[PDB]
Amino acid sequence: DNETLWDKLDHYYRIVKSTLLLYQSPTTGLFPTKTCGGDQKAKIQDSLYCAAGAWALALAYRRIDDDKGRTHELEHSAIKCMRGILYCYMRQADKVQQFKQDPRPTTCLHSVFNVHTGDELLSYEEYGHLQINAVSLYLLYLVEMISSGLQIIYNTDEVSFIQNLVFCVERVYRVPDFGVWERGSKYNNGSTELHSSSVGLAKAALEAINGFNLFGNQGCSWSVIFVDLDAHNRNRQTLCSLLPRESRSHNTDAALLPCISYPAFALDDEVLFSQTLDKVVRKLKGKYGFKRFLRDGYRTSLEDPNRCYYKPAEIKLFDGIECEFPIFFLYMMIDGVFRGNPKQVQEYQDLLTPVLHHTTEGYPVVPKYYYVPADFVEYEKNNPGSQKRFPSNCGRDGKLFLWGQALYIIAKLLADELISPKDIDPVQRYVPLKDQRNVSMRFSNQGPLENDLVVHVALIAESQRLQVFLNTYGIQTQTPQQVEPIQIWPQQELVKAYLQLGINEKLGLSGRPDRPIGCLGTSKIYRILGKTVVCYPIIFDLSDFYMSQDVFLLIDDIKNALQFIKQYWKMHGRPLFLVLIREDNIRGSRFNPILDMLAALKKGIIGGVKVHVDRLQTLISGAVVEQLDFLRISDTEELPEFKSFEELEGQQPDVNISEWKDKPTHEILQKLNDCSCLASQAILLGILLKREGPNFITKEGTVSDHIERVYRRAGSQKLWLAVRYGAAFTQKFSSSIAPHITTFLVHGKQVTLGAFGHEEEVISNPLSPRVIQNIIYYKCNTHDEREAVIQQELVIHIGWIISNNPELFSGMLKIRIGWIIHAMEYELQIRGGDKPALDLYQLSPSEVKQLLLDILQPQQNGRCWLNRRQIDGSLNRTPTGFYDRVWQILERTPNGIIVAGKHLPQQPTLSDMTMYEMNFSLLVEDTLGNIDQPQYRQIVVELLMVVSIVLERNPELEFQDKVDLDRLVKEAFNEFQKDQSRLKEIEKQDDMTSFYNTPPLGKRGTCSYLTKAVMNLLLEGEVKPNNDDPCLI
């Protein structure tokens, strides 16, 4: 090996010039998908890699002073594609504005373009253009090339579009997409899903592009890109939630490999990285490459090329015959070099060589995929990995896989140590176990295992009367006026300032959409127009919802926000969490709890979060303070001075709903004057807005603001009846609800919003705030408007629990809040006894929260097992692994399972699903959805458990006929009935109550009754002898 380094790079010089740089589009700089055939199609994602391949060789070409001009040819080969990629997106800047406001498949940036003009080729109907990775990979690569010194962004107008490109990528945590393989899922029905590979890339893209100057070394404060920390965090939360699964339909996908490595390295958790990794390695590795995913029908022998969609049952025909992609070996080879283990480079090089092809000139060719011939699909299905596969691309045919060709150049250079990993990844994305001090990248000063962040908390009082009153009890609250350099702003105020970020009228982009700023954003310190700004978190706002005025709720809203900042805030400086105390907090008995948290806040630890209590001037002196120059680069120094926080200088309802709603006469208006309750006029003025128009006038004025003034009055004086009708008949929404439903649904927890016994809407995939508004109020509930107000309460409370106590919502596939209200109200009937129970519409939100915690706790306490079965059954709490076990029950049962008029067959269920599959869980719930009586349902699941603990231990007994659990349930009850009749002869007939209070496990437990039932029915069939286990008799 005496060749000069000129020689080895010339070896790689050829390959790129002959196999990738020959086919680069001279006009748009793009890289066509099909090298031969005359196709104009160029994809966003693959074209990014092709430029990076020349970039990788370009960095290798930086090591020679005598490059004969090769370095600039390969450096600007990347720039030509990225600028052409950049050029394509503006061409669609109208779509970018639409996707920013309303994320949808029909408003997104496109993914395929004319290679020779850059014009749009396929419409939304023809092609699924929602591919977040392509936009995210662009932003991740764009900073990656700019950091190395390439100049792609040329003027401030491109800065605004890339800034707006961040605003689109900021919302990928909740917008589903078709993903890398433009299919969406394994079913290929055109239905969009959330993918970890797509979501992870945006997190990596936002991490690198945050604060990055698009102008490189030649840049100033007007060329930095600002990334919403909250939007990145919500995307970060989704990525760990979905993983190790790529999507709902995908248990594991080999497309996760770019997600956990080159280009993203988006996972900062090694363990997860390991668990994500093996499921890719174990389930998708093959001799000829990595299969895209299990049951992938892309370019398979059993797939009709004409149809653009796959039949729901066609999926099982793709099992064991998935095409193996050699490119994913090249991905692994880079992984070996980057993370320092050398074998992984060699073992995945030894697999790449046999599947590698060559041109006429000897230049190696990376095939796209290897497909098993239709002549051998049966043999391949029987024994996978034993039949030869034919390459999609072989060379000498005119077809080359440029994305694979690009990775080949990158991987070999790192393997040959012609590019060091630090050069090819300039904005560290792979950080070794030495994981400290990376902005937005989970590595704070403490590192990857310590999270004892000390959060800077400043106490701000609403009024001067308050701060003296708080001082008299030992709490030291500064006040707004006291701090002139420091101007305190509402979180909605930072939005207006942020509508000016990325504004360009020339391309017609409006900037950052009007959105609430989360805890992480409000945690920073800001400079707008030269005035120092500190924003108190949105959890102190009294407009979004009516749960914020309750001190006990505000007591925990501070607590979980403090926990949220402590664990997610991984920036350089310490966050600022301003606290704001209003008069309504102190007045009444509400002073007692707020003082204690203030006192514990003084101590230095709250909610397990270390805090630093001091004056706002002291707490801001040297921290890294966020710069708001875009409000000044447009010369808007005379922008209106943003409105800082300003210092301020008893019976049950005697009127029943049915009593006067049924009353026909319109005299009820006189009753409004006759009645004196605050909750009353919440209704009379509420029906007034419906009965005689929206903006009718009365004694005080237009009725529209009276309901609002009542709600303002009601919330402060804490008669929570009126504050619920007032908040219902005015149709208000909390902005925190919109991504609450997203958070539940990305955990696999299906959300439905409809009252018990009324129409319920299934939210399978997440929707936008506009859509959920009509579902909350208009279409779902019309019997009572106040149903939404209580409905809107828990979905914030559920969001609180799912974060603080994730385990508490385990076992339930779906959180039906409407049934939770029925569960919520029914337990009070048990709690109240022979007394008119407390109304759920009368309790304060903390009581609703504490009620929610009490009855959704684990071991329900002191409940006759009847009440446990009511709570658990109405709550749809299923045992851990219940869905797994019924699959096993469904596996060795010929005639499936019948539950109260539904039929769960063995086929096509077994062929179309997997034992861990998420889709199967819905079907069994659909099978059990008809159980009207909740304790019957819990009896059904234990019976379903009972056969499971029966069947798996007892592998010889199989069903012969259909399994109707109702017959299994009753026969257990009658044989139950005879024994207790033998004891005391209970005269109640057809009453399940004696069965429900019976404990599952005990002397004569419900399980013991149930297994006898399942023992007999199994015993009425053939006892199959095992080949594995010989029989002694």
Binding site: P26, T27, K68, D119, W222, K506
Partner: protein, 262 residues
Amino acid sequence: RSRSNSGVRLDGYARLVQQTILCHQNPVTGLLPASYDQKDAWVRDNVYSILAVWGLGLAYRKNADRDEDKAKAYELEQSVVKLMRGLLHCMIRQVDKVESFKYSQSTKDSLHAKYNTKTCATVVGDDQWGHLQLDATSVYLLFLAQMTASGLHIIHSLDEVNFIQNLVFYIEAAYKTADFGIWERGDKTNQGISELNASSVGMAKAALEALDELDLFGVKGGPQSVIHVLADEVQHCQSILNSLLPRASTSKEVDASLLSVV
């Protein structure tokens, strides 16, 4: 410590250019419209209209010792690069036209003088306008050479090198080819009669003398990026101007467009 008075007067100059020329630069492709009434972009007006942007960029780069001065110099220089590369897209989207005009010097195989300022496309057909203007492409090539010598990196690939050479052959026969000229009207009669106007031939000679042995990635270049110009056509151009001057064409005793040549 403080910015020099050159810097402040340059900031005034930058506000002038922003308000006048650069605020109509179409962000998507970097081109400029003619007016609010005529929305399309001429390649000649585009190449010339960024001369002020170029001068601002070089003037700022001379005193670019601070982050903001460096960044504004970068913005001006790369706005210039944006416009000339957008015009490169416009020209390369008619590569068949360049190839045809190389052999058969007809007016129907010529690069359009105007392009869609929004999509790098041809708004009008090959016959709805007088498109063959061998001084507009000439000024484009001459300024491309001048920018590459002053360090601006406009072209990015060897395909761009080959297209620039085929443009060289496009402008090579400008001395023997009749064109509608700087005023898009041919002769004095304004009847679609293309004529050999001296401005086109002179700008052709200027570009050809500019693009000789000029490495077109700049100092970070090699033999593959040398633009090769035969001095035979250059000297034929000079001879034709000598025969023409002070006349600009056979039909015109003198045209002020010769200020773009002298």
